[PDB]
Amino acid sequence: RHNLSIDGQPLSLAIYAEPTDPKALLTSMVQASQGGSAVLPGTLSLYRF
Amino acid sequence: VSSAIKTTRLAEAIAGIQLYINRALNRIEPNARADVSTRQFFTDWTVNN
């Protein structure tokens, strides 16, 4: 009834649908918004330019 | 039986009727007609089975 031989050996070759390969993992650089310095009013020097 | 085993409609009909003849000739099912069971076909059942 279970498709076996008289000795118990199976008569139908099975299948398993092989697992899907290795995996690629990558990393990336990340940048963010950056500001600059400000300018203040200047002092008056005692010396010439 | 398992779904793995296959057959044909005519082959399965032959197997079913063969089983019925064996049960009837061997007094396994009651009220079997003793006159019919002595036909030449059933006397030669050793080769007609």
| CB within 8 Å of chain B, chain A residues 3-22 | 3, 11-12
Per the CB < 8 A criterion, the answer to whether B21 and B45 are in contact is: yes
Residue of chain B whose alpha carbon sits nearest to that of A13: B4
In angstroms, the CA A1 to CA B17 distance is: 19
- Judge: B4–A3 Cβ closer than 8 Å, yes or no: yes
Tokens of A24: 């690629």
Resolution at which this structure was determined, Å: 3.1
| CB within 8 Å of chain A, chain B residues 3-42 | 4-5
Q: Which experimental method was this entry solved with?
A: X-ray
Per the CB < 8 A criterion, the answer to whether B24 and B37 are in contact is: yes
- What's the per-residue H, E or C state across chain A? CCCECCCCCECCCCCCCCCCCCCCCCCCCCCCCCCCCCCCCCCCCCCCC
